[PDB]
Amino acid sequence: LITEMSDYDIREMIQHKHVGRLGYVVDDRPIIVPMTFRFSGGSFYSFTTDGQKTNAMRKNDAICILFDQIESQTKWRTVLVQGRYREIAREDEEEAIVRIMANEPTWKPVFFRVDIEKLSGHQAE
Amino acid sequence: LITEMSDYDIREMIQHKHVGRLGYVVDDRPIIVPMTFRFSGGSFYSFTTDGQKTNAMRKNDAICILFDQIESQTKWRTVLVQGRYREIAREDEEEAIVRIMANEPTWKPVFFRVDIEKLSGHQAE
């Protein structure tokens, strides 16, 4: 019943789905929080004004993002990005901002990107 | 802009929101997967036929569930359950099944529950 999604559908999803759910680890326990992301040049870009998220991901840089479109229990698509927290230096914030905003599909903070180590996508129909 | 949700709204949400997103840890990295849950007698009950989830949560029982209702970037509610994977013994599966199904609000597998260590809920309006 569970199938691998085509690269086409994985791409449509990570290009067009604005909100994903970020997973990080604090003291060996998982935390999940919704965040907006922009896929650009092979990484996902975001930012937060929440210093607790920033400090947690600084201490443990192993993170993930789930994107999904759930129609029912048996009709759904999920894309999981596993990778690494990479904080953007102050002098690179303008670059990050333009990447986040530039030509977005008709949709102090600390900026970061998620560099991809594994990208997987599956569906049920 | 971010407020604590009332216990009333936290309860309405974990009673009526069928799908949450389960967080677990594999080799010090976070994984997130959508699952259906039932809140009953202070724990969340679910099951999976996916042996990789089962084995992962057996090896590391620190897990979480996010429930959320996101209207926009500035209008949303999130409830995070942090707790422990507790696998249901075969002889307790019928109990688990009746708990999952009994009087549900008009909505071999290995059964499990999530026992709650922290429950928090926040909103933005």
Closest-CA distance, B35 to chain A, in angstroms, reads: 9
B61 burial level (CB within 10 Å; 0-12, 13-18, 19+): middle
Structure-determination technique: X-ray
Closest-CA distance, B114 to chain A, in angstroms, reads: 13
Query: What residues contact residue A60 under an 8 Å CB cut-off, 6+ apart?
Result: A24, A25, A26, B28
What does this entry list as its resolution, in Å?
2.2
Find the angle CA(B73)-CA(B68)-CA(B117) to the nearest 5 degrees.
Answer: 130
Residue of A nearest to B71 (CA): A19
Task: For residue B32, give the nearest of A29, A62, A66 by CB distance.
Answer: A66
Is residue B116 a contact partner of residue B64, using CB atoms and an 8 Å limit? no
Class of the CATH-defined domain A1-125: mainly beta
Find chain A residues with C-beta within 8 A of B80's C-beta.
Answer: 31-33
The Cα B93–Cα B109 span in angstroms is 10
Find chain B residues with C-beta within 8 A of A29's C-beta.
Answer: 25, 62, 64, 82
The Cα B32–Cα A34 span in angstroms is 12
For tokens 């922290």, what's the residue? B118
Beta-strand (E) ranges in chain B?
Answer: 2-4, 19-26, 29-36, 38-40, 43-48, 62-70, 76-87, 110-124
The Cα B52–Cα B50 span in angstroms is 5
B10 burial level (CB within 10 Å; 0-12, 13-18, 19+): buried
All structural domains of chain B with their residue ranges: 1-125
**Best residue in A2, A19, A29 for a mutation probing chain B (most B CBs within 10 Å):** A29
For tokens 């049920």, what's the residue? A124
A83 burial level (CB within 10 Å; 0-12, 13-18, 19+): buried
Find chain A residues with C-beta within 8 A of B119's C-beta.
Answer: none
**Best residue in A21, A28, A32, A114 for a mutation probing chain B (most B CBs within 10 Å):** A32
Question: Could you give the C-alpha distances from A106 to A18, A102, B78, B120, in angstroms and in order?
Answer: 11, 11, 26, 33
Task: For residue A34, give the nearest of B60, B62, B78 by CB distance.
Answer: B78
Query: What residues contact residue A59 under an 8 Å CB cut-off, 6+ apart?
Result: A26
Is residue A38 a contact partner of residue A103, using CB atoms and an 8 Å limit? no
Contact A70 B24 (CB under 8 A): no
Contact B31 A82 (CB under 8 A): yes
For residue A42, which amino acid is it? G
The Cα A113–Cα A39 span in angstroms is 9
